Design a protein around this motif. Structure first.
Motif, PDB file in Angstrom:
ATOM      1  N   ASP A  20       0.865  -1.175   0.000  1.00 26.50           N
ATOM      2  CA  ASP A  20       0.000   0.000   0.000  1.00 26.50           C
ATOM      3  C   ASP A  20       0.903   1.226   0.000  1.00 26.50           C
ATOM      4  OD1 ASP A  20      -1.692   2.117   0.563  1.00 26.50           O
ATOM      5  OD2 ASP A  20      -2.801   1.066   2.123  1.00 26.50           O
ATOM      6  N   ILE A  21       0.871   1.994  -1.091  1.00 29.25           N
ATOM      7  CA  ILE A  21       1.778   3.127  -1.245  1.00 29.25           C
ATOM      8  C   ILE A  21       1.635   4.107  -0.089  1.00 29.25           C
ATOM      9  CG2 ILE A  21       0.205   4.454  -2.717  1.00 29.25           C
ATOM     10  CD1 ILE A  21       2.639   5.338  -4.340  1.00 29.25           C
ATOM     11  N   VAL A  22       0.437   4.218   0.490  1.00 33.67           N
ATOM     12  CA  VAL A  22       0.249   5.084   1.652  1.00 33.67           C
ATOM     13  C   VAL A  22       1.103   4.599   2.815  1.00 33.67           C
ATOM     14  CG1 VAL A  22      -1.426   5.880   3.363  1.00 33.67           C
ATOM     15  CG2 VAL A  22      -2.016   5.873   0.926  1.00 33.67           C
ATOM     16  N   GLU A  23       0.970   3.317   3.166  1.00 30.43           N
ATOM     17  CA  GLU A  23       1.741   2.769   4.277  1.00 30.43           C
ATOM     18  C   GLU A  23       3.232   2.784   3.978  1.00 30.43           C
ATOM     19  OE1 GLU A  23       0.564   2.148   7.367  1.00 30.43           O
ATOM     20  OE2 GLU A  23      -1.105   3.170   6.366  1.00 30.43           O
ATOM     21  N   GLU A  24       3.605   2.536   2.724  1.00 31.00           N
ATOM     22  CA  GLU A  24       5.017   2.566   2.366  1.00 31.00           C
ATOM     23  C   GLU A  24       5.605   3.958   2.576  1.00 31.00           C
ATOM     24  OE1 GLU A  24       6.665  -0.170   1.666  1.00 31.00           O
ATOM     25  OE2 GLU A  24       8.527   0.570   0.795  1.00 31.00           O
ATOM     26  N   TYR A  40      -6.886  18.295 -12.899  1.00 31.04           N
ATOM     27  CA  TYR A  40      -7.471  19.259 -11.975  1.00 31.04           C
ATOM     28  C   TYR A  40      -6.952  19.104 -10.556  1.00 31.04           C
ATOM     29  CZ  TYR A  40     -10.636  19.401 -15.956  1.00 31.04           C
ATOM     30  OH  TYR A  40     -11.152  19.467 -17.230  1.00 31.04           O
ATOM     31  N   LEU A  41      -6.072  18.130 -10.327  1.00 37.53           N
ATOM     32  CA  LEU A  41      -5.609  17.773  -8.991  1.00 37.53           C
ATOM     33  C   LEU A  41      -6.775  17.571  -8.027  1.00 37.53           C
ATOM     34  CD1 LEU A  41      -2.435  20.009  -8.589  1.00 37.53           C
ATOM     35  CD2 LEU A  41      -2.557  17.678  -9.514  1.00 37.53           C
ATOM     36  N   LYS A  42      -7.820  16.907  -8.516  1.00 41.71           N
ATOM     37  CA  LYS A  42      -8.953  16.504  -7.685  1.00 41.71           C
ATOM     38  C   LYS A  42      -8.684  15.078  -7.228  1.00 41.71           C
ATOM     39  CE  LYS A  42     -13.123  17.291  -9.115  1.00 41.71           C
ATOM     40  NZ  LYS A  42     -13.933  18.079  -8.149  1.00 41.71           N
ATOM     41  N   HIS A  43      -8.302  14.926  -5.963  1.00 44.42           N
ATOM     42  CA  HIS A  43      -7.792  13.654  -5.455  1.00 44.42           C
ATOM     43  C   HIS A  43      -8.933  12.852  -4.820  1.00 44.42           C
ATOM     44  CE1 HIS A  43      -4.049  15.647  -6.280  1.00 44.42           C
ATOM     45  NE2 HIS A  43      -4.222  16.519  -5.301  1.00 44.42           N
ATOM     46  N   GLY A  44      -9.804  12.327  -5.678  1.00 44.17           N
ATOM     47  CA  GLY A  44     -11.048  11.728  -5.213  1.00 44.17           C
ATOM     48  C   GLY A  44     -11.019  10.253  -4.859  1.00 44.17           C
ATOM     49  N   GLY A  45     -10.188   9.484  -5.554  1.00 45.32           N
ATOM     50  CA  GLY A  45     -10.179   8.043  -5.392  1.00 45.32           C
ATOM     51  C   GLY A  45      -8.889   7.476  -5.941  1.00 45.32           C
ATOM     52  N   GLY A  46      -8.797   6.151  -5.916  1.00 42.51           N
ATOM     53  CA  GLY A  46      -7.579   5.502  -6.332  1.00 42.51           C
ATOM     54  C   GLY A  46      -6.420   5.910  -5.445  1.00 42.51           C
ATOM     55  N   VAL A  47      -5.232   5.921  -6.045  1.00 47.08           N
ATOM     56  CA  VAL A  47      -4.036   6.350  -5.331  1.00 47.08           C
ATOM     57  C   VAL A  47      -4.222   7.756  -4.784  1.00 47.08           C
ATOM     58  CG1 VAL A  47      -1.606   6.962  -5.641  1.00 47.08           C
ATOM     59  CG2 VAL A  47      -2.501   4.797  -6.543  1.00 47.08           C
ATOM     60  N   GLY A  49      -6.898   9.589  -4.084  1.00 44.32           N
ATOM     61  CA  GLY A  49      -7.818   9.688  -2.967  1.00 44.32           C
ATOM     62  C   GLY A  49      -7.207   9.169  -1.683  1.00 44.32           C
ATOM     63  N   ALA A  50      -6.478   8.050  -1.766  1.00 47.91           N
ATOM     64  CA  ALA A  50      -5.870   7.457  -0.579  1.00 47.91           C
ATOM     65  C   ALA A  50      -4.756   8.339  -0.021  1.00 47.91           C
ATOM     66  CB  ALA A  50      -5.364   6.048  -0.898  1.00 47.91           C
ATOM     67  N   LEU A  51      -3.875   8.843  -0.891  1.00 51.54           N
ATOM     68  CA  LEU A  51      -2.801   9.714  -0.421  1.00 51.54           C
ATOM     69  C   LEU A  51      -3.375  10.964   0.237  1.00 51.54           C
ATOM     70  CD1 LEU A  51      -0.259   9.419  -3.425  1.00 51.54           C
ATOM     71  CD2 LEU A  51       0.038   8.496  -1.126  1.00 51.54           C
ATOM     72  N   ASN A  52      -4.328  11.613  -0.429  1.00 50.72           N
ATOM     73  CA  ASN A  52      -4.907  12.828   0.128  1.00 50.72           C
ATOM     74  C   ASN A  52      -5.549  12.558   1.488  1.00 50.72           C
ATOM     75  OD1 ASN A  52      -5.922  15.599   0.139  1.00 50.72           O
ATOM     76  ND2 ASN A  52      -7.905  14.576  -0.109  1.00 50.72           N
ATOM     77  N   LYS A  53      -6.283  11.450   1.607  1.00 48.24           N
ATOM     78  CA  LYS A  53      -6.887  11.095   2.887  1.00 48.24           C
ATOM     79  C   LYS A  53      -5.825  10.984   3.970  1.00 48.24           C
ATOM     80  CE  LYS A  53      -9.644   7.331   4.991  1.00 48.24           C
ATOM     81  NZ  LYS A  53     -10.395   6.068   4.717  1.00 48.24           N
ATOM     82  N   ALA A  54      -4.678  10.381   3.639  1.00 45.87           N
ATOM     83  CA  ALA A  54      -3.603  10.224   4.609  1.00 45.87           C
ATOM     84  C   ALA A  54      -3.006  11.554   5.056  1.00 45.87           C
ATOM     85  CB  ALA A  54      -2.515   9.305   4.047  1.00 45.87           C
ATOM     86  N   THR A  55      -3.116  12.610   4.242  1.00 42.31           N
ATOM     87  CA  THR A  55      -2.698  13.959   4.631  1.00 42.31           C
ATOM     88  C   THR A  55      -3.801  14.761   5.317  1.00 42.31           C
ATOM     89  OG1 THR A  55      -3.308  15.216   2.620  1.00 42.31           O
ATOM     90  CG2 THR A  55      -1.204  13.985   2.579  1.00 42.31           C
ATOM     91  N   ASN A  56      -4.925  14.126   5.643  1.00 43.78           N
ATOM     92  CA  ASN A  56      -6.028  14.820   6.297  1.00 43.78           C
ATOM     93  C   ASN A  56      -6.553  15.963   5.426  1.00 43.78           C
ATOM     94  OD1 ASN A  56      -7.853  15.424   8.455  1.00 43.78           O
ATOM     95  ND2 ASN A  56      -6.423  16.976   9.220  1.00 43.78           N
ATOM     96  N   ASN A  57      -6.519  15.777   4.105  1.00 44.64           N
ATOM     97  CA  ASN A  57      -7.015  16.724   3.099  1.00 44.64           C
ATOM     98  C   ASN A  57      -6.060  17.899   2.868  1.00 44.64           C
ATOM     99  OD1 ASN A  57      -9.279  16.752   1.185  1.00 44.64           O
ATOM    100  ND2 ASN A  57      -9.794  18.760   2.038  1.00 44.64           N
ATOM    101  N   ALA A  58      -4.896  17.944   3.518  1.00 48.13           N
ATOM    102  CA  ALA A  58      -3.961  19.037   3.267  1.00 48.13           C
ATOM    103  C   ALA A  58      -3.461  19.030   1.826  1.00 48.13           C
ATOM    104  CB  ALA A  58      -2.794  18.975   4.244  1.00 48.13           C
ATOM    105  N   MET A  59      -3.271  17.841   1.244  1.00 52.21           N
ATOM    106  CA  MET A  59      -2.885  17.754  -0.160  1.00 52.21           C
ATOM    107  C   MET A  59      -3.915  18.439  -1.057  1.00 52.21           C
ATOM    108  SD  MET A  59      -2.090  14.343  -2.425  1.00 52.21           S
ATOM    109  CE  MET A  59      -0.498  14.033  -1.662  1.00 52.21           C
ATOM    110  N   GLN A  60      -5.206  18.204  -0.805  1.00 53.32           N
ATOM    111  CA  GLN A  60      -6.245  18.826  -1.623  1.00 53.32           C
ATOM    112  C   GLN A  60      -6.254  20.339  -1.463  1.00 53.32           C
ATOM    113  OE1 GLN A  60      -8.460  16.925  -3.827  1.00 53.32           O
ATOM    114  NE2 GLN A  60      -8.023  19.002  -4.553  1.00 53.32           N
ATOM    115  N   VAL A  61      -6.102  20.834  -0.231  1.00 53.47           N
ATOM    116  CA  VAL A  61      -6.084  22.276   0.006  1.00 53.47           C
ATOM    117  C   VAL A  61      -4.943  22.928  -0.768  1.00 53.47           C
ATOM    118  CG1 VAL A  61      -5.779  24.038   1.784  1.00 53.47           C
ATOM    119  CG2 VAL A  61      -7.295  22.097   2.201  1.00 53.47           C
ATOM    120  N   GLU A  62      -3.747  22.342  -0.680  1.00 53.23           N
ATOM    121  CA  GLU A  62      -2.603  22.869  -1.414  1.00 53.23           C
ATOM    122  C   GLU A  62      -2.838  22.801  -2.920  1.00 53.23           C
ATOM    123  OE1 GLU A  62       0.665  20.224  -1.561  1.00 53.23           O
ATOM    124  OE2 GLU A  62       2.175  21.807  -1.707  1.00 53.23           O
TER     125      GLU A  62
END
Ligand SMILES: Cc1c[nH]c2ncnc(C(=O)N[C@H](CC(=O)O)c3ccc(Br)cc3)c12
Length: 167
Positions: A20-24, A40-47, A49-62
Motif C-alpha cells: 500500500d503506497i500510503v503505508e510505504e 485538476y488535482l482533484k484527489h477523489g479516489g484511487g491512489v 484519494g488514498a494519499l490525500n486522505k492520509a494527509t487529512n485533506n492538506a494535499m487537496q487544500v494545497e
C-alpha cells in the motif's frame, strides 16, 4: 544505499513490491512520492484519494491553491508540491485515463517526469481506475524511467501477475 526494503529488483533501476503506497510512504518518508493525479488535482479516489486522505485533506487544500494560480496540468505532465506527512515532495503526474479516451502514447510522456528525480516511490501510472493495462504500464516504466524507481502495487494478485509476466 537507501531505506526501501523487500523490493524485487526488475532491472538496473526499477524495483517492485506488493504494498500500500500510503503505508510505504509513512514508513520510508521518501524524498519523492508520486501521485496518480488528474489534470485538476482533484484527489477523489484511487491512489490520489488514498494519499490525500492520509494527509487529512492538506494535499487537496494545497492543490486547489495550485490550480487557482496555474490552471490545470496537461495529460502527460506533472507538478511538484509538498509531500506533507508522507514524503518531502509529492510529484503529481497525470497519466492518460482510458476511461476518458486519452491517448495511451501519453503514458511514456507521463513516465518521463520521473527522470527529473534521482529516486522515487511510485504507483504504476494509468493503472487501477485510470483503466490502462498494468502490464503495459510496467513495460513503459522500465523502458522510460532511468532514475531509481520503487513501484508499489496495492493488489497482491496483480503484483504476482506483474512479476510472473515480466520480460
Ligand atoms: C488506492 C490505493 C491506496 N494505496 C495504494 N497504494 C498503491 N496503489 C494504489 C492503487 O490504487 N493502485 C492502482 C493499481 C494497483 O492496484 O496497484 C492504481 C489505480 C489508479 C491509477 Br491512475 C494507478 C494505479 C493504492
Amino acid at each position: 544505499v537507501n531505506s526501501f526494503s523487500g523490493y524485487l529488483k526488475l532491472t538496473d533501476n526499477v524495483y517492485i513490491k506488493n504494498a500500500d503506497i500510503v503505508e510505504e510512504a509513512k514508513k520510508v518518508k521518501p524524498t519523492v512520492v508520486v501521485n496518480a493525479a488528474n489534470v485538476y488535482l482533484k484527489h477523489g479516489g484511487g491512489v490520489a484519494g488514498a494519499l490525500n486522505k492520509a494527509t487529512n485533506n492538506a494535499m487537496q487544500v494545497e492543490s486547489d491553491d495550485y490550480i487557482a494560480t496555474n490552471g490545470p496540468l496537461k495529460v502527460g505532465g506533472s507538478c511538484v508540491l509538498s509531500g506533507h506527512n508522507l514524503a518531502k515532495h509529492c510529484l503529481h503526474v497525470v497519466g492518460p485515463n482510458v476511461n476518458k479516451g486519452e491517448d495511451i502514447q501519453l503514458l511514456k510522456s507521463a513516465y518521463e517526469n520521473f527522470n527529473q528525480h534521482e529516486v522515487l516511490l511510485a504507483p504504476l501510472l494509468s493503472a487501477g481506475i485510470f483503466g490502462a493495462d498494468p502490464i503495459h504500464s510496467l513495460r513503459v516504466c522500465v523502458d522510460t524511467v532511468r532514475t531509481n524507481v520503487y513501484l508499489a502495487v496495492f493488489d497482491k494478485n496483480l503484483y504476482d501477475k506483474l512479476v510472473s509476466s515480466f520480460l
